[PDB]
Amino acid sequence: SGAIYVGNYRVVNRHLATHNDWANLVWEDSSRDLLVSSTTAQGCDTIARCDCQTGVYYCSSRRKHYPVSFSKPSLIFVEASEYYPARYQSHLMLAVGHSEPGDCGGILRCQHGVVGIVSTGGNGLVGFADVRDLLWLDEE
């Protein structure tokens, strides 16, 4: 579980969005596993605007932050689950690291700010949904 809070926006994994997030929808993309809803209070996270490939992510299943190298945002095959059928998820970045079902929403951060959130995993792998191309998160 977890979210990004920037300006008047809440960014969550689309598969974990509450019915109230849908009522307050701003933008969603199933292919990216992302949903953004509007918020009443202003948030204080800063989104990174960079091409960093090293950062630190939060792993709730170990109660630990880990330093990781990660691949550039790309179209990656993700196995079927209870949330999606087998498909290519876009804007996804992979790292060698622990992840399990329950770790989605953990922030990936670099020196510039928030890069993305945990979205997928595998045997010794963790995938992050990138948010650095969503320039509009910094305005209105």
Ligand X SMILES: NC(=O)[C@H]1CCCN(C(=O)Nc2ccccc2OCC(F)(F)F)C1
Binding-site residue positions for Zn(2+): 50, 52, 110, 112
Clarify whether 104 is annotated catalytic.
yes
The residues near 82 (Cβ < 8 Å, ≥ 6 apart) are none
Q: For ligand X, which stretch binds (CB under 6 A), given 23-31, 46-54, 75-83, 107-115?
A: 75-83
Nearer to ligand X, 105 or 111 (CB): 105
- Work out what residue 121 binds among Zn ion, ligand X, none; the CB cut-off runs from 5 to 8 Å by kind: ligand X
Of 80, 82, 96, 87, nearest to 128 (Cα)? 96
98 token code pair: 């622990």
Say how far apart CA 13 and CA 78 lie, in whole Å. Answer: 15
Candidate residues 101, 111, 133, 136; the one interacting with ligand X per rule CB under 6 A: 101
- Work out what residue 83 binds among Zn ion, ligand X, none; the CB cut-off runs from 5 to 8 Å by kind: ligand X
Of 104, 53, 55, 107, nearest to 78 (Cα)? 104
Clarify whether 98 is annotated catalytic.
no
Q: Which residues are known to be catalytic? A: 15, 33, 104
